[PDB]
């Protein structure tokens, strides 16, 4: 998911 | 961890700094609205806030110290809430509007632009009306949008790490009331007046996300991968 | 109003004594499940329990010093969400079970029988065990209950928002939780703690209300149960 | 409005 990267 | 270990004022000063930027719209103010165009500065503003969401969210003491994975579902859950406090703080001086950004600022009315959108206008200036009606102070509406984020996604689910982190943000709220020269009597009473607001914002996300979904069903306008799913996390 | 002048000793024996009683299902317990029959306990019980609901809303203090309209108003927002809080409250002593009734106890396995049921006695669960670690009490529980009648619609009476006399009540029941918990012996800083934690479980309680009724809407919408008009007004108000 | 009704009854 999109956030899962944005948070990394 | 370190969180636990902030004092009242320290976590407010955390908080403060913490806060995201006001962005702005792109909407061009020389030409009318269309249920299209309407949807559509809405839902780009709200993609590009949560990039700066995620941001503050990791700016939120013990936030970090949450898996990826807990991390994930926190947001997921509570990300429309979390937009939501923001307008109604942000409309908080503007009775009868909703400030989505500083050059677009809604009139109540501007909601029938949009089919099913009034109705969620109409209870999130209510919202506005009560925030108003109590002179809710900026430190306490970021101790709020906090729980928001710690809150909402918690019994979906570290547990007891999350309550503890909670604890420390209404030791903080309780200690502005007293700053402020509340009595113990008043102190609890405003308490319990700003957290049950949360359960109204709840709500709103609640029927804003109904809403949202069939917009896009509707396909009214196309919405952002990330918005899309953030929005398919709910269902 | 004399909701006002009561002493927290009075509000808490005001709440008890109005408490509705636990009925029971109609559960034929040597036949088989179906989603609709199912659906049929669940909602006859409901129907059942909603006529002892209004009747416990005009004992709690101050709620017949509202208007009539309001009285609707606040029971229409809220029914679902205090059918749900009585539920959580009844299945504390067994987990992993929701006690709807003496004769209806049901696990999440039973919940799949009904589509789309599961993913909300999950929620319900969860809760259950949150005030089972939290070691509600029931004169806690009853302060909460109705927080919730006044609370929840009290924010859509509009179109600019109205109550002062609703959010004094609500002053009072915060009075009442405050002194049960300093009776029981929390510290100062436990007593605002727990208030919190008490209060947010009511953003959970929502959650699940707004959830239920789209999945109420969503059986009655597939002809899967009839419902009686009361419900179908009910929830018709969402 | 059978709420209405039975608020009254
Ligand atoms: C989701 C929503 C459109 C966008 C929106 C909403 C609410 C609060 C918002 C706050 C923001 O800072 C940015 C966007 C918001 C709307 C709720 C329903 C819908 C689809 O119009
Ligand atoms: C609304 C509901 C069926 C009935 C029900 C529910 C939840 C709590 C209840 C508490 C009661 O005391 C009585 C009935 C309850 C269900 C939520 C979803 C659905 C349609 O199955």
Same mark, same amino acid.
């Given at each position: ?8 | ?72 579902? @926190? ?22 509007? @909703? ?85 113990? *009597? ?6 319990? *007046? ?42």
């Amino acid at each position: 998911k999109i956030l899962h990267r944005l948070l990394q | 961890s370190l969180a636990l270990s902030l004092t009242a004022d320290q976590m407010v000063s955390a908080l403060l700094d913490a806060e995201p930027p006001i962005l702005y719209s792109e909407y061009d103010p020389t030409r009318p609205f269309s249920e299209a165009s309407m949807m559509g500065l809405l839902t780009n503003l709200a993609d590009r806030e949560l990039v700066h969401m995620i941001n503050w969210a990791k700016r939120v003491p013990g936030f970090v110290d949450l898996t990826l994975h807990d991390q994930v579902h @926190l947001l997921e859950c509570a990300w429309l809430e979390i937009l939501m406090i923001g307008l109604v703080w942000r409309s908080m001086e503007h009775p009868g509007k @909703l400030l989505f950004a500083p050059n677009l600022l809604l009139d109540r009315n501007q909601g029938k632009c949009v089919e099913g959108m009034v109705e969620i206008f109409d209870m999130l200036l209510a919202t506005s009306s009560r925030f108003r009606m109590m002179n809710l102070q900026g430190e306490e509406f970021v101790c709020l949008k906090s729980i928001i984020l710690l809150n909402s996604g918690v019994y979906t689910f570290e547990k007891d790490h999350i309550h503890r982190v909670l604890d420390k943000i209404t030791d903080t709220l309780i200690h502005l009331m007293a700053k402020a020269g509340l009595t113990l *009597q008043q102190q609890h009473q405003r308490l319990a *007046q700003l957290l049950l607001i949360l359960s109204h914002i709840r709500h709103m996300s609640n029927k804003g996300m109904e809403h949202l979904y069939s917009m896009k069903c509707k396909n009214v306008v196309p919405l952002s991968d990330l918005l899309l799913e953030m929005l398919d996390a709910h269902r």
